[PDB]
């Protein structure tokens, strides 16, 4: 079970773990919004080769995933699960957490994302050759930005994205179920305390995050089929472990 004192302690524990494992502080991302890529710089990105742009994005995604891994390890109860279920939860949830965290680096006023020191629109990634996926991710960040998430709200929501008792392959499903339920109580208690329960109906549907990750794996296999040696020789090992089954 859990009393009111224990639920509130869980809230603060989750928010602290998130603060300690956020890649960049929100204030750092906000104070850079005027720093936008020039038209010549955007053109420079569009002329880079497809495989060089793919490995740069793979590198940035891998760095972000590593902070999500540390977030999970600080999450109360996660290290208490068996390592099989720890890996199952991270394999299916790490990318999903990064997609939610991305909205902190997204400026809804001009539809730009902070990328390699400056803000750029989705045309910055045109060399990737997956404009539908990029557009879907930018649209997802746009829908999240309309909610005006606080850092505490992102902390508790991404914990629930990670701790999902429905992931296929879990061996101790009931143990994850109790941890997910405690985090749901903490999330909803914090929304009730802060009069923010109206955002519950506006959160993205369940299949939305899994649809984006499926698109990502789908586009990766298209690129890997065109440049298999590039992936083997120049992609990060953690990236290939999560997304190309290695």
């Amino acid at each position: 079970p859990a009393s009111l004192t224990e639920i509130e302690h869980l809230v603060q524990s989750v928010c602290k773990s998130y603060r300690e494992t956020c890649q960049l502080r929100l204030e750092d991302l906000l104070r850079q919004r005027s720093n936008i890529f020039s038209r010549e710089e955007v053109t420079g990105y569009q002329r880079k080769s497809m495989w060089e742009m793919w490995e740069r994005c793979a590198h940035h995604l891998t760095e972000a995933i590593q902070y999500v891994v540390e977030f999970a390890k600080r999450l109360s109860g996660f290290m208490e699960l068996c390592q099989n279920d720890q890996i199952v939860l991270l394999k299916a949830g790490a990318m999903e957490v990064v997609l939610v965290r991305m909205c902190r680096a997204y400026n809804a006023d001009n539809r730009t994302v902070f990328f390699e020191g400056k803000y750029g629109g989705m045309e910055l990634f045109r060399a990737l050759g997956c404009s539908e996926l990029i557009s879907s991710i930018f649209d997802f960040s746009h829908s999240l930005s309309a909610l005006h998430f606080s850092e505490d709200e992102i902390a508790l929501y991404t914990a629930l994205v990670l701790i999902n008792a429905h992931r296929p392959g879990l061996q101790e499903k009931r143990k994850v179920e109790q941890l997910q339920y405690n985090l749901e109580l903490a999330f909803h208690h914090h929304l009730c305390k802060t009069h923010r329960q109206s955002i519950l109906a506006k959160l993205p549907p369940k299949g939305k995050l899994r649809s984006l990750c499926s698109q990502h794996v789908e586009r990766l296999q298209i690129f890997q089929h065109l440049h298999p040696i590039v992936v083997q020789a120049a992609f990060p090992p953690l990236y290939k472990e999560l997304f190309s089954t290695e």
Binding site: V69, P237, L238, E241
Partner: peptide, 8 residues
């Protein structure tokens, strides 16, 4: 594999 080492 990498995830195993990061969790240790």
């Amino acid at each position: 594999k990498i995830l195993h080492r990061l969790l240790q």
